[PDB]
Amino acid sequence: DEITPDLWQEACWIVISSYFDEKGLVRQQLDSFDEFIQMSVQRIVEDAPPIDLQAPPRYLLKFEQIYLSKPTHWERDGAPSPMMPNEARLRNLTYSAPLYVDITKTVIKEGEEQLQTQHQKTFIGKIPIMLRSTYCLLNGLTDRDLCELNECPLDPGGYFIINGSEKVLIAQEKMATNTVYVFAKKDSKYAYTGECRSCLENSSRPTSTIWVSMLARGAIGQRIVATLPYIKQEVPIIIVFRALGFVSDRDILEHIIYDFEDPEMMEMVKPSLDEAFVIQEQNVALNFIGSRGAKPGVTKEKRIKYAKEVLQKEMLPHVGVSDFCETKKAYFLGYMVHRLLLAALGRRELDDRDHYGNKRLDLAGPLLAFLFRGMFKNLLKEVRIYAQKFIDRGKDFNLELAIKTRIISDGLKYSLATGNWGDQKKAHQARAGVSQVLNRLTFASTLSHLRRLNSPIGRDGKLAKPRQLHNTLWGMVCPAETPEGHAVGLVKNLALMAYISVGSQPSPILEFLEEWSMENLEEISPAAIADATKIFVNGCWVGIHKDPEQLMNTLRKLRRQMDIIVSEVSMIRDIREREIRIYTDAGRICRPLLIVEKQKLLLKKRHIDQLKEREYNNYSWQDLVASGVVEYIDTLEEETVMLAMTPDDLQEKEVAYCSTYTHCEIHPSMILGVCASIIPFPDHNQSPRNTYQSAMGKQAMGVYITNFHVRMDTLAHVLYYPQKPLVTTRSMEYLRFRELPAGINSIVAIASYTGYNQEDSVIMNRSAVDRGFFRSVFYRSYKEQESKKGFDQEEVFEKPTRETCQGMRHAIYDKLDDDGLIAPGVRVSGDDVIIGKTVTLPRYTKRDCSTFLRTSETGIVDQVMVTLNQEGYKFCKIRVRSVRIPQIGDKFASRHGQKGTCGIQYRQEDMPFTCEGITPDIIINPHAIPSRMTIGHLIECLQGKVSANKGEIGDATPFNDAVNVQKISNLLSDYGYHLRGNEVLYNGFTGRKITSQIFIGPTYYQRLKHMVDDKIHSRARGPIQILNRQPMEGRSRDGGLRFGEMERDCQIAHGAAQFLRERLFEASDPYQVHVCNLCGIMAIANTRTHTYECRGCRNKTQISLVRMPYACKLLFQELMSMSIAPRMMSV
Amino acid sequence: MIIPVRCFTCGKIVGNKWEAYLGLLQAEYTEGDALDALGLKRYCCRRMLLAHVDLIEKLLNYAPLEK
Amino acid sequence: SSVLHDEFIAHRLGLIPLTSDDIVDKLQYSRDCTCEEFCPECSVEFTLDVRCNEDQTRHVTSRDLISNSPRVIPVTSRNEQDDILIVKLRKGQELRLRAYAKKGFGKEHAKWNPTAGVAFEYDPDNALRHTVYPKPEEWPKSEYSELDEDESQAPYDPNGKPERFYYNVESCGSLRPETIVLSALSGLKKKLSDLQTQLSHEIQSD
Amino acid sequence: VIFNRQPTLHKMSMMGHRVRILPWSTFRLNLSVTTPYNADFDGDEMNLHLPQSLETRAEIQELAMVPRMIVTPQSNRPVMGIVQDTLTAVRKFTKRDVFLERGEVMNLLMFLSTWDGKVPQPAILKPRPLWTGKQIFSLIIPGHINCIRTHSTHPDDEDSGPYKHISPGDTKVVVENGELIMGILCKKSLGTSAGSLVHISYLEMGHDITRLFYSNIQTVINNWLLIEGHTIGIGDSIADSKTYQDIQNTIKKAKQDVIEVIEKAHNNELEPTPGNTLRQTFENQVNRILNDARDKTGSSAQKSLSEYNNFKSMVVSGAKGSKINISQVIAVVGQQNVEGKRIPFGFKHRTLPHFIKDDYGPESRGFVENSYLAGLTPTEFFFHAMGGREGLIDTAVKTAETGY
Amino acid sequence: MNAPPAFESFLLFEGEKKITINKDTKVPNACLFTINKEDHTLGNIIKSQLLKDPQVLFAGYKVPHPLEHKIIIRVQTTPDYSPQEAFTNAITDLISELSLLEERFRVAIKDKQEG
Amino acid sequence: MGKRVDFSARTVITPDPNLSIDQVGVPRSIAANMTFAEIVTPFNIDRLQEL
Amino acid sequence: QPMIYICGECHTENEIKSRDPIRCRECGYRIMYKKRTKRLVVFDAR
Ligand SMILES: [Mg+2]
Ligand SMILES: [Zn+2]
Ligand SMILES: [Zn+2]
Ligand SMILES: [Zn+2]
Ligand SMILES: [Zn+2]
């Protein structure tokens, strides 16, 4: 029955494999989008108010149902056809499906003359579709079906195709809503502040933040204030309580202080009462609120109405926005004050801003919902204006012409295309970085980009606290994978078994709590709240309970049985403070864990047995979760959980550590993400090395996707001979690194050989490189289109001619065909022409606008595709193919942060060799190891020697006590090798033995995208910028290198004044001006007629020539634009 | 994508051994014994056969450009 | 029409070993040939023409490299070891090419390297102490060692010099191993002879 | 040309070079001139500027050329020195038991540019002619400079007792009349510190002679290292069973000591020291215990090393690494700190959900009792990732403020 | 972009001499032989054969740059001898050694195939 | 204070133990792109005509 | 002169002249590919 330790390493990984058979790696994206389409769009459409318009006749126009068909495309003839994602990629279409809404317009004029007209399936917009979602044509297709459609079966999906560009929505971090968080700002007028970003269940407005603060000590005592929304002045809490109908001080403290035996709380609230005694009735308090507001009505009536509306709608919407909710709002605001007092009295800890239990991940669904709310509101507005301008004339109108569908369509398309998350007009208030271009450089880069999280703290911020790896990231975020540049700690990555909750309605839970012995908050007396336990659901205090323990037992049983409580519902019992917080909302990152009985796992051997035959008896992960054996625990419920790292922790020990565990890790290696799960032995490296590899696995070459032959990507690198690593971890089985690997096993020798590998460099074998070692192919796609925008000027693909075309370069166009397009198989060098495009003029009647190769490439045309774009003019894509043979300067890396460029390449006779004539493919310098402490590199090399000599794949899973260095060495000594991986090598040049026995063996190396040929650049009098006549910027522009301020300072320190003048004047922008010797302002010179005159001074004899930079002339002219007179006085 | 022709290290021909290697593996050989049957004694050539991923078999799941 | 681009196929064809035993001495380098781009005195013509019409995958192997010279053929195609795989083709895919093989050696490209490993060793027992084992007991014995198992390395020979070099020259297939050794000795001797000729011209010109 | 690397921090980040046209597509640099640029070859790119007049060319040739840039005015010492392979190898080369044969010596003399063509009389004539590494470095050393240094492993109690001028360990570098009379050369003798051989060469001999000195050290020593070789592997990370038992006993004793301090604090048997609160005093005691454990285990690992250990070779020469790195690879990685304190209670009174609440023990709060060869446990792995994230954040955040 | 053709390691450029002899002025009876388009293969054997001559006082070689394709062999002999004569005799001795080795390898192959 | 300049080049750096400290190894393509305006004289008339 | 293209979906060789919408005559598919040139490109098998 029990899984014994000897079977555990199989059982756990069997369980893990079942998880990845059920979910995958992009499950969060697909589930978010599915919830958005199934629920969020319908909720948004129904939550909009019916637009009642009347001059008389009236019309309501109620939207009642939505229909999202499959993705289709409409040609110029208008025939709807099912559009495949690959066709969208090739034709630069948007993989979107039409959204139709049912509309009901009832005519009501007078005399009960009512009649309803329903417009079924009114086309309301087009919604882009996430690939492999339920509403994707690739849904449920087999691998054969996907290959029939020219799709990769290993492609995870989880992205959109907008204008042929694959866009991926990055999950955005945000502070959780409807939760009270008591912080303390050191530099502020308030000692303590308790904030609550409140938002109603079905979002319709932004988060309304309410603060309840305490004024810092230094009138008599500490005063509690409340910064309500839409009010620009602090308001005493007692005033707010009275404005809600609680005038008696006893009632207010009944709502705030639940234990009247506690004078400390009492004296700390007393200043607030003493400050609010002149105001003693609800109307006066409402008038005070309205007066403190930023729109103080001259008459107290409208002041009181405004205060009523604010306290009913903007104050704590999550508690309830309807009327008669003042009791719930009073209880909740009293809870906020109670929490603030507990913090000020030291009875509760301040809340941690960085705790991921306090955060939420805004995924594709809830982000598209924000867009859709804004866009549907704008659409209903436009419909209101259109219908109003017609009914004002007293006649009917056609809603089909009122609905301008471009709002929703173009809005979603623009937002996903650019990443600016918001309305196109508010292009600066909008937050960019959402919806990035999917990284297709290697399969690991694609997976990681699809599992990418973002902390929008702002890269400019230099506070390290949000960048720090918090304790609560354990199991939810990769500890290693993070960019090492300016976004350290802000851009994160999901751990492998991390699941972001999609969201759920609290209705069944609330109903069960009602049927259960919970007492509502309006029905109780406050005297009961002392000993009772509060119950919050999605931040709303809904009631109280008397035995929280057996309530938690009941709820956990219900969630483990897949009863009314769904698996993703978090249920935290804080014991010391008697809250029970239940969460069903979306964005809660959680992970699966094995539940533990008294001191035993519930995962018995029968579950492993049924999981082994997963493909026959359809016993899956969901059956494991439904059995009550596995549980999803979120960051906030982990605080109440006692984990076992392994079932070995559940053994009874000579001194028991815990003996009351509640859960167990499925495997600790699941704390790593996609790119860190490729590192072998990451627990033997320094952690920065693991981070650098997690970044560098994403630039590694491989086969980024199986269907690369049909993709017209702008840039693509494919390795000739990718190999799976000889030394692998058990997590790559689910990353599909074995099916799409990104490196080669290289016989690497760590040695000092000729000095060409010093300081992070490598010596490669020229003979191996000749045999296809780390050879790659680079595919570059050029796009072009001939626009017939108007009869004024039209472009067209056609072989240009020297007699008709004007802007025709001296390059030869013979490689083009009569259609103007080069043919596949044609070898093209730099500056060559691949598309001959000519544009009609207003060298006559047509000008050359041909597409050249990006300079200095020298490839062969791989293929040419011709089609029609969305509007329907001819559209061409040409993929050119360039074989990249590794060379000096190309960057290579192992899986341990050990990067370096090729210093030199030696032939096989020049490389050092073992007694059996094995030469290293790569030689790396021993000095790269000691400071870096990448012992995982050495253990991987030794394990790889054992694996190659044994005919197996080494197990480098991080935390594995069945694999240590002594075992690997003992294994290697059985194959006739030195147990530590050393060998006697001979000098290739002289054949003499090397005195020091070299450490050599197979290690998995990666070829990175950074090849020297894509970086080398030179300039000598090339093109210049228009504004300031200085060299351009970039290799692509044939630009010059920037001689910056620091270079100026260095050369000033050198004392090299002529070199400094050459760099900053003569090699950048030499220029001449003519200055009036009297006024010092630039004069008018006419060198052809030799007439120089200053219009200002009315002189034409006292002019002087001045040699100045063009940028300085431009500066002085831009100062004269500002009415400044910079007078260059030559005397 | 396809089995290399030569071993990158020594230059021994491994191109003619992939199919035989697979046939030995379905014959219930261990990978080590299979590599021994094909005469790959240096761990470089054993690396070549043992770490190869036949991606061409997946690229042949797509219909060609011309019928 | 195969799934491997043209340079992939070309590189792959270059690495197929061709029987070179008696023909390599007769052929000339295209540098030295007085012909045009090609001729039968400096090159060998190969042709390959395969089309997958049937439903099973067609293995385009080195057996499909048809030569004009019967003496220079792919080693695997020589009259066991299977044929080197050039490319796998799917129904409707087709590969038709025309290759020319030339005379060269491994300095120019590893495809002209005739060896599949050259094991070279000397002083199997570390008597000259050209290696210094920190722990001589930990190291396995050479196949050429003559030491009793208790003895880890030979006693140090102060008056010793490297003699008795052991070789294991493995052939890729193009040449016989003994032909590799004989051709190596002849090539080294002709390098020295040419060097001496140029030396004599330099000495007499001074 | 002026050769530059960004960020251009000081005047040595832009130096004058003479162009040497070579086949492939990278900028090829000497390895001594990498420290001034702060340049390594992990994908770094550098900028070449070509002066376009005889006046600017003369300016760069007389002011900014690299040999004129050997000594920096910032700290009146060399800015470039001997570096990784050449430094490990010159340390191994100038050991007392390095004996070169006639053919090896001629091979090395082929790579001396400043060689008068006279083979020096070997240090050993019989039974077999043998030159020493010091005897060839004496040929590399220019002019008649005189220099006294001490190898990094020089015992501090040797200059007092006898054998001061005849060092048993071949420490106490002594160069006289441009001959390395004795001593093992290392970072202290050929690095960028003040009073080293490269500095004294620049001060006594010109910048041209010093340029040749750098080049000759590098060429001769690299071509000798082709014979000697240098490596590193698992065998250098391993220690003997006695060392492992000593380290584990040290760690066990340290954990029991921390348990005793915890028990004292729990029983109110701990009184605070002046200037600190009780929490801070407890933290000081625990951190002192664990730092003592780390240092003792590191000393155990360091003494366990042999003379053939390659970590010890690179640390001794000063080429790369430190004794703390050896301790972390062999003995114990040690305490992980976030903001200068132990791992914070990021959960509620816990560092991770795997620990009990209020657990101030060493493993709970981020003491990695394993080495990098042993491998970190999952909690040690996460805490080490936290500590390393602190360094990454510091490196990425200090740059803007320091540049401003 | 910058890859030299692989034949440039073996082939002489037009007007480039295979070997050049330059008198070394530092010491008497010394010469520098700059040999183009050769490498360690001939340099090592020529040096080691020259070391077998008791009339040779110095014999060394270097490849000044691996990316370049020449070697320099420095030979110093006793005053009654010449470095050019020493170099010639070294090449003659290497040729005779290789001829003998080739004939003996042919004999050994014949014995092995026969019995 | 800082600006783009002509006669500049940039590429990856690489080790070269066989250069002196004051030398820089330059590709032939960078050197073929970059030029130095040398004045003609009877001292260099022949060499510059050759170039 | 003919510029025959191949269909991305039906793989049909069909001729299309300039100023013609890009449509396969056999199945109407909108994506077409050019055929391999007849020019003679040479590869050094290296
Ligand atoms: Mg760098
Ligand atoms: Zn004027
Ligand atoms: Zn091999
Ligand atoms: Zn010919
Ligand atoms: Zn068609």
| Angle between helix A326-344 and A249-256 (nearest 10) | 70
Structure tokens at C135: 């722990």
Q: Which residue of E has its CA nearest to F28?
A: E2
Q: How many CB atoms lie within 10 A of CB A406?
A: 13
Written as one string, the DSSP assignment of A537-555 is ETTEEEEEES-HHHHHHHH
Written as one string, the DSSP assignment of A4-40 is PHHHHHHHHHHHHHHHHHHS-SSHHHHHHHHHIIIII
**B26 Cβ contact list (under 8 Å, min separation 6):** none
Q: What are the φ/ψ torsions at residue A72 (nearest 5 degrees)?
A: -135, 165
Rounded CA gap, C9 and C15, in Å?
10
| Helices first, then strands: H and E counts in chain D | 14, 14
Rounded CA gap, A890 and A775, in Å?
11
Pairing of strands A859-868, A851-852: unpaired
Q: What length does chain C have?
A: 206
Query: Which fold would CATH assign to domain D84-228?
Result: Enzyme I; Chain A, domain 2 (1.10.274)
* E strand or H helix at G17: none
DSSP A155: -
Q: How many CB atoms lie within 10 A of CB F5?
A: 25
C-alpha distances out from residue A131 to A135, A168, A740, D185, F41, Å = 8, 10, 20, 65, 72
Residue whose C-alpha is closest to residue A739's, from A437, A447, A941, A439: A447
CB contact under 8 A, G34 and A91: no
Residues A592 and A497 sit within 8 Å (Cβ to Cβ):
yes
Rounded CA gap, D15 and D30, in Å?
13
Residue whose C-alpha is closest to residue A209's, from A222, A194, A224, A219: A194
3-state secondary structure of C101: strand
Q: Which residue of G has its CA nearest to B64?
A: G11
CB contact under 8 A, A1050 and D13: yes
Q: Which ligand is nearest to the CA of C43?
A: 4
Residue E60 is nearest to which of D24, D25, D106, comparing CB atoms? D106
3-state SS of B24-49 is: HHHCCCCHHHHHHHCCCCCHHHHHHH
**From the annotation, which residues of A make up the binding site for Zn(2+)?**
1076-1079, 1094-1095, 1097
Rounded CA gap, E65 and E86, in Å?
26
Can you point out the beta strands (E) in D79-177? 99-100, 131-132, 147-148, 174-176
A760 catalytically annotated: yes
CB contact under 8 A, F29 and E64: no
Which residues of chain A are within 8 Å of residue D382 when distances are taken between CB atoms? 469, 474, 479, 671
Which residues are within 5 Å of ligand 3 (an ion), measured at CB? B 7, 9-10, 12, 42, 44-45
> A279 pairs with which residues across the strands?
none
Which residues of chain A are within 8 Å of residue D60 when distances are taken between CB atoms? 1056, 1059
**A1087 Cβ contact list (under 8 Å, min separation 6):** none
Q: How many Cα neighbours within 13 Å face the side chain of A450?
A: 28
Residue whose C-alpha is closest to residue F17's, from D312, A1010, D225, E47: D225
Write down the residue that tokens 């639940």 correspond to.
Answer: A258
Write down the residue that tokens 């239940």 correspond to.
Answer: A582
Alpha-helical (H) ranges within chain E are 40-51, 83-114
Rounded CA gap, C70 and C20, in Å?
11
- C-alpha distance from C204 to closest chain E C-alpha (Å): 11
Residue D25 is nearest to which of E1, E26, E72, comparing CB atoms? E1
Which residues of chain E are within 8 Å of residue C29 when distances are taken between CB atoms? none
Choosing from A47, A251, A760, A817, which is the catalytic residue? A760
Rounded CA gap, A808 and A817, in Å?
17
3-state secondary structure of A163: coil
Residue whose C-alpha is closest to residue A990's, from C186, E7, D106: D106
Residue B10 is nearest to which of C88, C92, C117, comparing CB atoms? C117
Long-range CB pairs of D108-111 (<8 Å, 24+ gap) are D108/D136, D108/D220, D108/D223, D108/D224, D109/D136, D109/D139, D109/E58, D109/E60, D110/D223, D110/E60, D110/E61, D110/E62, D110/E72, D110/E74, D111/D216, D111/D219, D111/D220, D111/D223, D111/E62
Burial of C131 (0-12, 13-18, 19+ CB in 10 A): buried
Structure tokens at D155: 């015992």
Residues A839 and A847 sit within 8 Å (Cβ to Cβ):
yes
3-state SS of A958-990 is: CCCCCCCHHHHHHHHHCCCCCCCCEECEECCCC
Rounded CA gap, D345 and D108, in Å?
61
Q: What are the φ/ψ torsions at residue D286 (nearest 5 degrees)?
A: -65, -45
Residues G33 and A865 sit within 8 Å (Cβ to Cβ):
yes
Rounded CA gap, D166 and D147, in Å?
16
Pairing of strands D27-29, F8-15: parallel
Residues D237 and A938 sit within 8 Å (Cβ to Cβ):
yes
* E strand or H helix at D277: none
For CA atoms D209, D215, D217, D223, the dihedral sign is negative
Q: What are the φ/ψ torsions at residue A362 (nearest 5 degrees)?
A: -80, 105
**A56 Cβ contact list (under 8 Å, min separation 6):** A109, A394
For CA atoms D156, D159, D165, D166, the dihedral sign is negative
User: CA C67: distance to chain centroid?
Assistant: 20
Structure tokens at G44: 């050094």
Structure solved via: cryo-EM
Write down the residue that tokens 């002083």 correspond to.
Answer: C123
R_g of chain G computed on alpha carbons: 14
Rounded CA gap, D46 and D36, in Å?
13
Q: How close are the terminal C-alpha atoms of chain D, in Å?
A: 29
What is the total count of domains within chain E? 1
**C117 Cβ contact list (under 8 Å, min separation 6):** A916, A917, A918, B10, B11, B12, B42, C168, C170
Q: Which residue of C has its CA nearest to D130?
A: C158
Q: How many CB atoms lie within 10 A of CB C36?
A: 7
Residues C164 and C122 sit within 8 Å (Cβ to Cβ):
yes
Residue whose C-alpha is closest to residue F30's, from F2, F4, F9: F9
Residue whose C-alpha is closest to residue A415's, from A398, A401, A393, A431: A431
Rounded CA gap, A452 and D36, in Å?
39
Q: How many Cα neighbours within 13 Å face the side chain of A1007?
A: 34
Rounded CA gap, A469 and D352, in Å?
13
Which residues of chain D are within 8 Å of residue E1 when distances are taken between CB atoms? 25
Q: What length does chain D have?
A: 404
Rounded CA gap, A994 and A1012, in Å?
33
Q: What are the φ/ψ torsions at residue E13 (nearest 5 degrees)?
A: -75, 155
**A823 Cβ contact list (under 8 Å, min separation 6):** A815, A817, A861, A864, G34, G35, G36, G37, G39
Interface of D with F (CB under 8 A): 1, 3, 5, 16-33, 39, 41, 43-50, 52-54, 65-67, 80, 211-212, 214-215, 218-219, 222
Q: What are the φ/ψ torsions at residue D254 (nearest 5 degrees)?
A: -65, -40
Rounded CA gap, A711 and A797, in Å?
23
Which residues of chain A are within 8 Å of residue G30 when distances are taken between CB atoms? 75, 87, 91, 867-868
Q: What length does chain A have?
A: 1131
Q: What is the largest CA-CA distance in chain F?
A: 41
Q: Which ligand is nearest to the CA of D46?
A: 1
Assess C15–A contact: CB distance below 8 Å, yes or no: yes
Structure tokens at A540: 């709303």
| Angle between helix A605-612 and A5-22 (nearest 10) | 50
Q: Which residue of F has its CA nearest to D86?
A: F17
Q: How many CB atoms lie within 10 A of CB A435?
A: 23
Q: How close are the terminal C-alpha atoms of chain B, in Å?
A: 23
Write down the residue that tokens 């009247």 correspond to.
Answer: A260
CB contact under 8 A, B65 and G11: yes
Q: How many CB atoms lie within 10 A of CB A959?
A: 21
Cα angle, residue A463 at apex, residues A458 and A468 outer, rounded to 5°:
95
DSSP C4: S
> A827 pairs with which residues across the strands?
A860
B7 is in an annotated binding site: yes
Rounded CA gap, C166 and C125, in Å?
13
Which residues of chain A are within 8 Å of residue F2 when distances are taken between CB atoms? 1042-1048, 1064
Residue whose C-alpha is closest to residue E20's, from E31, E29, E30, E10: E31
CB contact under 8 A, B59 and A709: yes
Assess G46–C contact: CB distance below 8 Å, yes or no: yes
Structure tokens at C101: 């093989």
Structure tokens at A170: 């990055």
CB contact under 8 A, G6 and B66: yes
Pairing of strands A715-719, A776-785: antiparallel
**A239 Cβ contact list (under 8 Å, min separation 6):** A276, A279, A285, A288, A289
For CA atoms A494, A499, A505, A509, the dihedral sign is negative
Which residues of chain D are within 8 Å of residue C158 when distances are taken between CB atoms? 127-128
Q: What length does chain F have?
A: 51
Residue whose C-alpha is closest to residue A693's, from A467, A444, A869: A444
Residues A901 and A758 sit within 8 Å (Cβ to Cβ):
no
Which residues are within 5 Å of ligand 2 (an ion), measured at CB? A 1076, 1078-1079, 1094, 1096-1097
- Omega into F42 within 30° of 0, i.e. cis? no
3-state SS of A745-781 is: EEEEEEECCCCCCCCCEEEEEHHHHHCCCCCEEEEEE
Written as one string, the DSSP assignment of C122-158 is E-SS-SS-SS--SSGGGSPPPTT----TT--SPPP-T
Touching chains, C (3+ CB pairs < 8 A): A, B, D, E, G
C-alpha distances out from residue A749 to A894, A928, A988, C85, Å = 13, 13, 14, 31
Can you point out the beta strands (E) in A546-680? 570-573, 580-583, 589-595, 630-634, 643-644, 663-664
Q: What is the largest CA-CA distance in chain C?
A: 74
Which residues of chain C are within 8 Å of residue B1 when distances are taken between CB atoms? 3-4
**F43 Cβ contact list (under 8 Å, min separation 6):** none
Q: Which ligand is nearest to the CA of A1095?
A: 2
Pairing of strands A833-835, A851-852: antiparallel
CA dihedral A1051, A1057, A1060, A1065 (to 10 degrees): 160
CB contact under 8 A, B50 and A919: no
Residue D23 is nearest to which of E4, E48, E58, comparing CB atoms? E4
Written as one string, the DSSP assignment of A977-1025 is S-TTSEE-EE-TTT-PBPSSPEEEEEEEEEEBS--GGGT-EE-SS--B-
C-alpha distances out from residue A924 to A123, A546, A927, C12, Å = 63, 68, 9, 28
DSSP A578: -
Q: Which residue of A has its CA nearest to C13?
A: A771
**Domain map (residue ranges) of chain G:** 1-46
Single-letter amino acid, residue D254: A
Residues A1077 and A1130 sit within 8 Å (Cβ to Cβ):
yes
CB contact under 8 A, C10 and G41: no
Rounded CA gap, A424 and A421, in Å?
9
**A98 Cβ contact list (under 8 Å, min separation 6):** A68, A69, A72, A123, A125, A126, A127
- The whole domain housing E75 covers 1-115
Residues A695 and A499 sit within 8 Å (Cβ to Cβ):
no
**D222 Cβ contact list (under 8 Å, min separation 6):** A754, A755, D85, D86, D89, F17
User: CA A168: distance to chain centroid?
Assistant: 8
Residue C191 is nearest to which of E6, E42, E105, comparing CB atoms? E42
Q: What is the largest CA-CA distance in chain B?
A: 44
CB pairs under 8 A between B and G: 11
DSSP D341: B
Rounded CA gap, F9 and A906, in Å?
27
Rounded CA gap, D100 and C47, in Å?
58
Rounded CA gap, A290 and A297, in Å?
7
Write down the residue that tokens 């634009």 correspond to.
Answer: A1121
Q: Which residue numbers come right before each break in chain D (C to N over 2.5 Å)?
A: none
